[PDB]
């Protein structure tokens, strides 16, 4: 009678609890998914940070647009035939 129903009813109740908690359950999937999302978001910025620097390193060892800017921005030296203007507040 009701014992046959109460048996399979309590099994589904305990089976629900093991789905939410425990190992690799719902909350484990939720917490790990949040961590994996934040890591690949950070690794995307780091990879862009490394690629942007590697691109300049490519133009540093006798390149073009990474050595002339350092000559202009840091050493204030120009090219011949270029009128140099200076802005003062």
């Amino acid at each position: 009678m009701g014992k046959l129903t109460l048996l399979l009813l309590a099994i589904l109740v305990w089976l629900q609890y093991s789905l939410w908690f425990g190992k690799n359950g719902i909350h484990d999937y939720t917490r790990v998914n949040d961590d994996v999302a934040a890591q690949q978001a950070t690794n995307a910025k780091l990879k862009a940070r490394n690629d942007q620097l590697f691109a300049e390193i490519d133009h540093l060892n006798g390149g073009q647009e990474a050595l002339e800017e350092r000559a202009r921005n840091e050493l204030s030296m120009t090219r011949p035939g270029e009128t140099f203007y200076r802005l003062v507040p």
Binding site: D51, Q52, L53, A55, E56, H59, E65, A66, E68, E69, R72, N73, S76, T78, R79, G81, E82, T83, F84, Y85, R86, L87, V88
Partner: protein
């Protein structure tokens, strides 16, 4: 006497249903087996043409019918052949009728002389004959960063448009350096640093750059802005 009427009244109506159902079946069996040679293009089409959808749907090498055609295979084939379409929605209607809904990309700039980019940052390609009439800015940059250069174009463009300038080209390098091109081929060689404050310096410096260029009868070739509160200007003879 009355039951014979009710029998005949029911049998005749029964006969009229089957006979009418037989010719209706004949109407629906000799019509549902057709290659749906019709086509309805409902949408704002500016680049795609009526012959483009027809030629692309028959490029599969098979004239599909009604019950023997998957719309998911048609919408994908339209996507694989028309890069300027954003959303394809091909649907079947009746025995010999089709419905294809198309949505195109609205180009606001040109990406690497061969592609285009819209406002939402999406990239696509259009043949040069269907877009040569458009006067659009030409954005350059490394692959995958069309939206980033678009953010720079707007920010540098809104400031430049304040003092009635026209930003024609905006190029970015893999190391994130900018080199703008204005009207009359005025190359603004920007740098990797504070780009907006270098560009704002050229705006304040320009009234003096032009009044000196007319003194010697020279043309502004390029204005290098890779300094701190400074700028080197190259010249060229005017034609």
């Amino acid at each position: 006497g009355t039951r014979l009427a009710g029998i005949l009244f029911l049998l005749t109506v029964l006969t009229t249903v089957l006979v009418s159902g037989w010719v209706v079946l004949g109407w629906m069996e000799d019509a549902q087996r057709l290659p749906l040679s019709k086509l309805v293009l409902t949408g704002e089409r500016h680049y795609t043409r009526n012959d483009d959808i027809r030629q692309s749907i028959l490029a599969l090498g098979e004239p599909g019918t009604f019950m023997t055609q998957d719309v998911n295979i048609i919408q994908t084939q339209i996507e694989q052949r028309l890069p300027w379409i954003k959303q394809v929605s091909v649907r079947k209607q009746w025995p010999d009728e089709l419905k294809i809904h198309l949505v195109e990309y609205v180009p606001i700039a040109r990406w690497n002389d061969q592609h285009m980019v819209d406002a939402e940052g999406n990239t696509f390609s259009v043949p040069p004959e269907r877009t040569s009439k458009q006067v659009l800015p030409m954005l350059y940059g490394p692959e995958g960063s069309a939206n980033e250069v678009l953010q720079g174009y707007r920010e540098m463009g809104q400031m430049l448009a304040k003092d009635r300038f026209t930003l024609k080209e905006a190029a970015m390098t893999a190391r994130r350096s900018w080199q703008l091109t204005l009207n009359n081929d005025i190359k603004l060689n920007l740098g990797r640093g504070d780009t907006m404050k270098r560009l704002a310096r050229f705006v304040e410096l320009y009234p003096v750059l032009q009044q000196q260029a007319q003194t010697d009868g020279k043309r502004i070739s390029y204005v290098d802005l890779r300094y701190d509160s400074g700028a080197a200007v190259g010249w060229a003879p005017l034609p």
